């Protein structure tokens, strides 16, 4: 009954935490738009998404209050009613707090936690390994998705880390970034379903068609048809050997993303991860992500425009692929 | 009335948060040794310290539970009974949590908060400036000490930031690191008492003897007589023009610190800031800092040994200077 | 007539610059073992290598004198006698010096230059683009291989740079590092043959089997049979669709490389790239790389041991795959 | 002339550019050094009372000059100075043998020393860097050495233990030093070296250690040297009287003049455009003609150039003000 790596296939969409209009103000106390939360979930299920992730960086795990988090997760779990797997996010400044939060949110009904590492003090390899072992020991029923983001969490999630995570049965998946070492990490970590970012799924699926069956998406929050079409066409390509349509969709996605990162730079992107993702979603018009909670509520205008252009581009793909789905 | 920069003078000692023997275990609750806490406070006051700071990096602001912090601050306040100023620490992942914590700990009776910036997402200049404005607006009774540590908080606390902080009345001081730009920062920020690290106090006090009248010390947790002697001798040097004795103390301090940083690297020290400072204090034998709360409870044995040697060296200074004091 | 991208296929092996016994001494003036140079070239040709690169970082382009370089290239050119393509390396501190060297080495009979960028001052995108345009304009008959090493050259060779290089006809190939963005770079640069590192060839050829027909090898300097076997088996996998044997070879290569990098870290490897590669080659016993020219003649002993072990592992692969080719 | 000592290095040490002809950005050009402007600059600096001349670091285009250009430039400087003030050439190169070759030649022409960074294609570690400088000093025992301690250019960060090692090499008499955060300690570790802070840090550094910190390096002097001369003179008087206010005010003026030089206030971004920004500043100040940048470093974003030009104008304004205070 605890999720397994084998159960993780297809399109895994990361949803934001919708905010109320006053959410940028430090005086506000209940800034989660719970009805927009429910609406997003039902829409994602209806689109055919395989699983839902949440409460990473752009999902504002860092900036929600604890009451906000419990209300958000409660609404998601009530809406899903067990139809698709759901991961909350419980990254925090220390092990004991992560355990506390993970227990409560799993109890409310999440299947797992998408989890980075404590980042006030930069972790080394043995520290990070111990940290995930501790969480899995404390909350054995929780599945774990490693949130392998070095910009946010400082630690760089190196090859030997993956070898160690593959020994922890609760660690079933990873929100993975660049795929330069995917070939080796798959070999080191046979028990983990590695999720590339949607734009890299095409390449990664070609490297290892047996293992690479799933990906994570934030572009889906601008309209999920694109990600659904990618998933479907890659399944087809694996069967027929004809990768041309999968390549065409993947190239479209890359172009849609081409203006997102300020000056092409993930490090500059990472300073504005929240505002840029939420602005992109706002601009696409598929969902209302809303204002960013403090302190990350200021984004330079030219960067915002890049994100908004990207949101329009993904909306255009959603309309194109909605028709191709029929 | 709220502490002013003018009132910040002399030796400001940063105390750890003493641990019980089980504190490394994620299963433990109530890991603060509150009696050792009280005993340290009384010893610091008896030594003649001007002010007490706490709950920075090595003070485990990151890894204490909220109940632990409340108990710790309560014990400190009851012990001090208003005789020296006291800063708690309330750095957290977002502005609302910082505000919440700061209000409570000030209400218990701390005079101010030693505060870095939220660090899951790296802050830019306008974000950092607005964050400190927000806290000051929200808790106008709290004095603020800027905890200007780029390794921990990613933000690098640049020149223009200091100019902005000088416009916020609550910002009375800074826990400052390298003094390469202290001359300019002093000009940009006339209203802030900049605290160099104890080892840099000699140089900084010669640069600007009118403004640089105070320093921060962790070495005092290995025996405060060194820091007290430095303070007293600098006051004398500023009056006589004879800096020989102040220089010799300051040079002893740098030597005592020479084995602390792994391979002389601040970045490598920063990965083990908690464990190395605590291990040094344990080794010096002036107080019992105790085990590190999870996750930061693993330190390479070579690095520990440098820390221990530094601890013994500072204990030797304390012995030497205790005799010169009386 | 100048090489084209279409003409670049199979195993492209990077040769060191063999040194005399006294080569680590600044007093020495003629440190290239020209007979070992000739021997290595004929052995690489006999093994069936497709082309030869030289005079990158471990090839000691930085530390050879000009007379040494000319003598080295003269010996290579006269040994090859037009049988396989050959690239010299002409990276230098400024455009004029690069041009002067490129003209003379091409005149002697190299087909092209493996070229990084001037690195005293870190280059930006338009500066780097102009640099390569200037070299191609000055020496129109030289093929260029982009040496895309950010550690050495500071510049990071971003996506827009590849789009620009594809417009320069002389730019036919790239010595490329991590393949995270290879899918996109191939799309942005249709006219370049991108050479992944031998360990990444498997994944890269699976990503794009039409475009990725070639790779670069330094492991071949420990015995080229492994690289020739990889090449041949990838050709067969592309035709049959059965990748298992190519995968086995590739996995073997990565295991042989697993001790090369100090602490698994490319940046720490990059500080000792010369001494580590040359020590690895010396240990494998296929060729005599010899001492490193000053200043890069000092390598920590444990790092050396890692490289020697890698050399032994690669030698063992060469003996294994020698038999499978016979 | 016996080799320079640290004790002989005092006052304002000005770093000169390598003046360029109008066609100097074109890779096709040879002889891009304006040798008459070179001579003129030297005589103007001597007339202003500078204590020593440095050259051929980063903005001095050590990386982008040809060898023939360097020889002509150094020959012109040496015949112009005619022994009146000490002079350092620059011989940083990609390897030890090339450094040695260039250093022997330029010393032989008549420079007193070399301002020397480390080979930077491969990032050096501590023992590698120490042996490099030992090798140069062994090879060219009559050259004084100025350590050019620039981590951005040279990758190596010139750590504390390195300075303890350099202090054992008699040839190493000075350092072009950057931020002063560890100056107090470096002085203690390296008793035999005259550390030169940047002109803007001289005030602070001289107050930290007035016995040891008697000299600084200046690129601002290339915009009009009166400011550097006045700073020098006023710090000498401050050390004697204990009244630092006038020295403080000049220093504060200098920092203000520098406030727009670094793109976004960032040393690392300035470092990408070190040549073009320094040379543009000097061109804007109008005291000398630095001229175009040799390839490849001939492209600078417009916004950044503008900050450099504003800085040049501000330093020209300081020169005019302090020229009047000098009488
Ligand atoms: C995960 C998503 C970010 O880490 C990220 C990474 C790469 C491209 C775009 C985005 O948003 C998260 O924010 O939880
Ligand atoms: C402050 C002290 C550290 O940030 C620090 C910095 C430099 C040397 C030693 C120490 O501990 C804190 O941990 O609160
Ligand atoms: C090219 C090869 C190096 O840049 C390098 C990169 C990665 C792994 C191993 C090696 O040698 C050269 O040194 O010319
Ligand atoms: C030395 C001067 C540069 O490295 C530098 C550093 C800081 C401010 C300004 C300048 O020019 C040189 O370029 O030779
Ligand atoms: O570098 C950032 C990044 C983000 C998502 C996927 C691949 C990447 O390289
Ligand atoms: O570089 C680290 C550092 C830490 C505390 C004080 C001064 C310093 O330079
Ligand atoms: O990024 C460094 C690197 C080095 C060798 C091979 C592949 C790589 O990604
Ligand atoms: O960090 C850059 C820098 C440049 C010149 C002088 C002092 C400095 O800190």
CATH number for A145: 3.20.20.70
Per CB-CB distance under 8 Å, the chain D contacts of C126 are: 299
Provide the terminal-to-terminal Cα distance of chain C, rounded to the nearest Å: 36
* Strand positions, DSSP E, D117-262: 144-148, 172-176, 194-196, 215-218
Number of other CB atoms surrounding residue D268 within 10 Å: 12
According to the annotation, is B273 in a ligand binding site?
A: yes
**Cβ contact, residue pair A264, C158, below 8 Å:** yes
Q: Residue B236's closest CA among B208, B205, B200, B197? A: B205
C-alpha dist (Å) from residue A296 to A94, A293, B131: 22, 6, 9
Per the listing, tokens 């041309």 go with A244
Method of determination used here? X-ray
Contact assessment for residue A49 and residue A11, using Cβ atoms and an 8 Å cutoff: yes
**Cβ contact, residue pair C97, D271, below 8 Å:** no
- In C128-159, which positions are buried (b, 16+ CB within 10 angstroms) versus exposed (e)? bbbbbbbbbebbeebbbbbbbbbbbbbbebbe
Name subunits touching B (3+ CB pairs < 8 A): A, D
Residue D302 falls in which region: left (phi positive, over 0), alpha (psi -120 to 50) or beta = alpha
Q: Does A257 map to a domain?
A: no
Contact assessment for residue A210 and residue A194, using Cβ atoms and an 8 Å cutoff: no
- The tokens describing A198, both together, are 């949607």
**Cβ contact, residue pair D252, B207, below 8 Å:** no
- In B196-215, which positions are buried (b, 16+ CB within 10 angstroms) versus exposed (e)? bbbbbbbbbbbbbbebbbbb
Per the listing, tokens 């010139």 go with D158
Per the listing, tokens 């931020």 go with D179
Dihedral sign (CA B98, B102, B105, B108)? negative
C-alpha dist (Å) from residue C277 to B51, C15, C280, C313: 56, 11, 5, 14
3-state secondary structure of B11: strand
CA–CA dist A174, A186 (Å, integer):
11
Q: C-alpha A230: how far from its chain's center?
A: 17
**A23, A295, A300, A301: best to mutate for the B interface, most B CBs within 10 A:** A295
CA–CA dist D270, D285 (Å, integer):
19
Per the listing, tokens 């104890």 go with B198
In the sheet that D88-90 helps form, which strands lie side by side, from edge to edge? Answer: D88-90, D113-116, D144-148, D172-176, D194-196
Closest CA–CA distance from residue D184 to any residue of chain B (Å): 7
Q: Across the strands, what pairs with A197?
A: A216
CA–CA dist A66, A60 (Å, integer):
12
CA–CA dist C67, D66 (Å, integer):
17
- The tokens describing B175, both together, are 């826990």
CA–CA dist A203, A195 (Å, integer):
12
Report which protein residue has its CA nearest ligand 2's atom 5.
Answer: B273
Q: Does D59 map to a domain?
A: yes
DSSP string across C44-88: HHHHT-SEEEE-STTTTTTT--HHHHHHHHHHHHHHHTTSS-BEE
A312 included as an active-site residue: no
Q: Do B and C count as touching (3 or more CB pairs closer than 8 A)?
A: no
According to the annotation, is B303 in a ligand binding site?
A: no
Pocket of ligand 2 (CB under 6 A): B 14, 56-59, 149, 197, 218, 273, 277
Q: Across the strands, what pairs with A175?
A: A147, A195
CA–CA dist B114, B127 (Å, integer):
18
CB within 8 Å of C292: residues ≥ 6 apart: C19, C23, C24, C60, C63, C274, C275, C278
C-alpha dist (Å) from residue C16 to A125, A170, C298, C319, D310: 35, 48, 18, 21, 50
- The tokens describing A30, both together, are 């209940």
φ, ψ for residue B132, nearest 5 deg: -65, -35
State the alpha helices, DSSP H only, in chain B: 34-47, 66-80, 95-108, 125-138, 150-153, 159-165, 182-188, 198-207, 225-240, 244-256, 266-271, 273-284, 301-325
CA–CA dist A34, A70 (Å, integer):
11
Contact assessment for residue A89 and residue A147, using Cβ atoms and an 8 Å cutoff: yes
Residue C41 falls in which region: left (phi positive, over 0), alpha (psi -120 to 50) or beta = alpha
> What's the domain range around A117?
5-240
CB within 8 Å of C230: residues ≥ 6 apart: C11, C198, C201, C202, C215, C246, C249, C250, C253
CA–CA dist D127, C301 (Å, integer):
13
Compare all CA atoms of chain A with the CA of B28 and give the residue at the minimum distance. Answer: A96
Provide the terminal-to-terminal Cα distance of chain B, rounded to the nearest Å: 35
CA–CA dist D1, D45 (Å, integer):
22
- E strand or H helix at B87, and its extent? strand B87-89
Which of C54, C64, C113, C149 maximizes ligand 3 atoms within 8 Å of its Cβ, making it the mutation to test the pocket? C149
CB within 8 Å of A100: residues ≥ 6 apart: none
Which ligand has the nearest atom to the CA of D276? 4
In the sheet that D215-218 helps form, which strands lie side by side, from edge to edge? Answer: D52-55, D11-16, D215-218
CA–CA dist B12, B218 (Å, integer):
9
Closest CA–CA distance from residue A49 to any residue of chain C (Å): 25
How much helix, strand and coil, in percent to the nearest 5, is found in chain D? 50, 10, 35
Report which protein residue has its CA nearest ligand 5's atom 6.
Answer: A177
CA–CA dist B195, B177 (Å, integer):
8
CA–CA dist D257, D222 (Å, integer):
13
Pocket of ligand 6 (CB under 6 A): B 177-178, 197, 200, 266; D 181
Angle between helices C301-325 and C225-240 (to 10 degrees): 60
CB within 8 Å of A85: residues ≥ 6 apart: A3, A7, A8, A50, A51, A52, A111, A112, A143
Contact assessment for residue D231 and residue D202, using Cβ atoms and an 8 Å cutoff: yes
CA–CA dist C48, A250 (Å, integer):
37
Contact assessment for residue D294 and residue D25, using Cβ atoms and an 8 Å cutoff: yes
CB within 8 Å of C76: residues ≥ 6 apart: C15, C37, C38, C41, C52, C54, C86, C110
DSSP C89: E
Dihedral sign (CA C303, C304, C307, C312)? negative
Q: What is the 3-state secondary structure (H, E, C) of chain A?
A: CCCCHHHCCEEEEEECCCECCCCCCCCCCCCECHHHHHHHHHHHHHHCCCEEEECCCCCCCCCCCHHHHHHHHHHHHHHHCCCCCEEEECCCCCHHHHHHHHHHHHHHCCCEEEECCCCCCCCCHHHHHHHHHHHHHHCCCCEEEEECCHHHHCCCCCHHHHHHHCCCCCEEEEECCCCCCHHHHHHHCCCCEEECEHHHHHHHHHHCCCCCCEEEECHHHHCCHHHHHHHHHHHHHHHHCCCHHHHHHHHHHHHHCCCCCHHHCHHHHHHCHHHHHHHHHHHHCCCCCCCCCCCCCCCCHHHHHHHHHHHHHHHHHHHHHHHHCC
DSSP string across B118-159: --SSPP-HHHHHHHHHHHHHH-TT-EEEEE--HHHHS----H
CA–CA dist A209, A224 (Å, integer):
22
Q: Does A161 map to a domain?
A: yes
According to the annotation, is D304 in a ligand binding site?
A: no
3-state secondary structure of C312: helix
Contact assessment for residue D250 and residue D230, using Cβ atoms and an 8 Å cutoff: yes
Contact assessment for residue B172 and residue B3, using Cβ atoms and an 8 Å cutoff: yes
Contact assessment for residue B229 and residue B198, using Cβ atoms and an 8 Å cutoff: no
In the sheet that B193-195 helps form, which strands lie side by side, from edge to edge? Answer: B87-89, B112-115, B143-147, B171-175, B193-195
**D151, D181, D261: best to mutate for the B interface, most B CBs within 10 A:** D181
- In C94-126, which positions are buried (b, 16+ CB within 10 angstroms) versus exposed (e)? bbbbbbbbbbbbbebbbbbbbbbbbbbbbbbbe
Per the listing, tokens 């001798």 go with B233
Closest CA–CA distance from residue B58 to any residue of chain A (Å): 10
Out of A154, A167, A175, A247, pick the active-site residue. Answer: A175
CB within 8 Å of D119: residues ≥ 6 apart: C62, C63, C295, D92, D93, D94, D95, D96, D99, D132
CB-nearest partner of A119 from B61, B120, B131: B120
CB within 8 Å of A263: residues ≥ 6 apart: none
CA–CA dist C250, C242 (Å, integer):
14
- E strand or H helix at B88, and its extent? strand B87-89
Cα angle for residues A181, C193, C18 (degrees, 5° grid): 80
CB within 8 Å of A54: residues ≥ 6 apart: A14, A15, A16, A17, A72, A76, A86, A87, A88, A89, A114
CA–CA dist D190, D165 (Å, integer):
8
DSSP B291: P
Q: Does B192 map to a domain?
A: yes
DSSP C97: H
Closest CA–CA distance from residue D29 to any residue of chain C (Å): 9
Which residues in chain B are immediately followed by a break of C to N over 2.5 Å?
Answer: none
Per the listing, tokens 């081409």 go with A258
3-state secondary structure of B105: helix
Q: Residue A105's closest CA among A59, A151, A150, A169? A: A59
φ, ψ for residue D306, nearest 5 deg: -65, -40
φ, ψ for residue D325, nearest 5 deg: -70, -25
Compare all CA atoms of chain B with the CA of A274 and give the residue at the minimum distance. Answer: B121
Checking DSSP bridges between strand D11-16 and strand D52-55, what pairing results, if any?
parallel
CB within 8 Å of D135: residues ≥ 6 apart: C26, C294, C295, D96, D100
Q: ω into residue C295 within 30 of 0, thus cis?
A: yes
CA–CA dist C308, C279 (Å, integer):
6
CB within 8 Å of A34: residues ≥ 6 apart: A71, A72, A75
Contact assessment for residue B172 and residue B4, using Cβ atoms and an 8 Å cutoff: yes
φ, ψ for residue D145, nearest 5 deg: -120, 135
- In B299-310, which positions are buried (b, 16+ CB within 10 angstroms) versus exposed (e)? beeebbebbbbb
Contact assessment for residue C295 and residue D128, using Cβ atoms and an 8 Å cutoff: yes
C-alpha dist (Å) from residue C206 to B12, B153, C182, C235, C246: 62, 41, 12, 11, 11
Q: What's the structural domain count of chain D? A: 1
Q: Residue B90's closest CA among B128, B119, B62, B124? A: B62
CA–CA dist B52, B44 (Å, integer):
8
Per the listing, tokens 């070579």 go with B302
Q: Across the strands, what pairs with A12?
A: A51, A216
Number of other CB atoms surrounding residue D255 within 10 Å: 18
Per CB-CB distance under 8 Å, the chain B contacts of A118 are: 62-63, 295
Q: Across the strands, what pairs with B215?
A: B11
CA–CA dist A112, A51 (Å, integer):
11
Q: What is the 3-state secondary structure (H, E, C) of D126-163?
A: HHHHHHHHHHHHHHCCCCEEEEECCHHHHCCCCCHHHH
Q: Residue D310's closest CA among D262, D267, D270, D273? A: D262
Which residues of D make CB contacts under 8 Å with C? 27-28, 58, 62-66, 92-98, 100, 118-125, 127-129, 131-132, 135, 139, 152-153, 271-275, 294-299
Per CB-CB distance under 8 Å, the chain D contacts of C120 are: 58, 62-63, 92, 120, 153
Checking DSSP bridges between strand D113-116 and strand D144-148, what pairing results, if any?
parallel
Contact assessment for residue B16 and residue B36, using Cβ atoms and an 8 Å cutoff: no
Q: Does D234 map to a domain?
A: yes
Q: Long-range contacts: C76-80, Cβ < 8 Å, 24+?
A: C76/C15, C76/C37, C76/C38, C76/C41, C76/C52, C76/C110, C77/C108, C77/C109, C77/C110, C78/C109, C79/C37, C79/C38, C79/C41, C79/C42, C80/C41, C80/C45, C80/C52
CB within 8 Å of C315: residues ≥ 6 apart: C222, C223, C283, C284, C285, C286
| Inter-chain CB pairs, A–C, below 8 Å | 42
Number of other CB atoms surrounding residue C187 within 10 Å: 18
CB within 8 Å of D283: residues ≥ 6 apart: D289, D290, D291, D309, D312
- The tokens describing B93, both together, are 């992942």
- E strand or H helix at D58, and its extent? none
- The tokens describing D15, both together, are 């770093």
Q: Does B311 map to a domain?
A: no
**Cβ contact, residue pair A183, C160, below 8 Å:** no
CA–CA dist A279, A302 (Å, integer):
12
Q: Give the residue ranges of the annotated binding site of A for pyruvate.
A: 147, 149, 175, 273
Burial of C81 (0-12, 13-18, 19+ CB in 10 A): exposed
CB within 8 Å of D171: residues ≥ 6 apart: D3, D136, D137, D140, D141, D143, D144, D145
Task: Provide the greatest CA pair distance for chain B.
Answer: 57
CA–CA dist B18, A325 (Å, integer):
62
D158: CA distance to ligand 8 center in Å?
14
CA–CA dist D306, A256 (Å, integer):
35
Q: Does A315 map to a domain?
A: no
Closest CA–CA distance from residue C149 to any residue of chain A (Å): 15
Q: Does A326 map to a domain?
A: no
């Amino acid at each position: 009954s605890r999720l397994t790596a084998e159960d993780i296939n297809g399109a895994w969409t990361i949803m934001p935490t919708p905010s109320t209009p006053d959410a940028s103000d430090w005086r506000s106390t209940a800034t989660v738009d719970l009805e927009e939360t429910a609406r997003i979930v039902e829409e994602l299920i209806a689109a055919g998404v395989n699983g839902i992730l949440s409460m990473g960086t752009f999902g504002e795990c860092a900036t929600l209050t604890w009451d906000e988090k419990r209300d958000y997760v409660s609404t998601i779990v009530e809406t899903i009613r067990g139809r698709v797997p759901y991961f909350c996010g419980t990254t925090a400044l220390n092990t004991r707090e992560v355990i506390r939060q993970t227990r409560e949110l799993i109890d409310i009904g999440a299947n797992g936690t998408m989890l980075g590492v404590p980042m006030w003090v930069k972790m080394d390899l043995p520290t990070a390994v111990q940290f995930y072992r501790d969480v899995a020991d404390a909350v054995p029923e929780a599945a774990i998705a490693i949130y392998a983001n070095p910009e946010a969490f400082k630690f760089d999630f190196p090859r030997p880390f993956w070898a160690e995570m593959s020994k922890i049965p609760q660690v079933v998946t990873a929100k993975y970034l660049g795929i330069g070492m995917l070939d080796l990490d798959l070999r080191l970590a046979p028990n983990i379903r590695f999720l590339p970012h949607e734009d890299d799924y095409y390449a990664a699926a070609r490297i290892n068609p047996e293992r690479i069956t799933a990906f994570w998406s934030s572009g889906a929050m601008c309209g999920p048809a694109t990600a659904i079409m990618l998933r479907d066409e890659v399944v087809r390509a694996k069967s027929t050997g004809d990768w041309a349509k999968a390549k065409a969709i993947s190239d479209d996605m890359r172009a849609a993303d081409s203006t997102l990162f300020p000056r092409g730079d993930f490090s500059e992107f990472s300073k504005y991860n929240i505002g840029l993702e939420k602005a992109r979603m706002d601009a696409a018009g598929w969902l209302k992500a809303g204002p960013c909670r403090p302190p990350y509520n200021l984004v330079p205008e030219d960067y915002l425009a890049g994100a908004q252009k990207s949101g329009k581009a993904w909306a255009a793909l959603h309309a194109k692929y909605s028709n191709e789905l029929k």
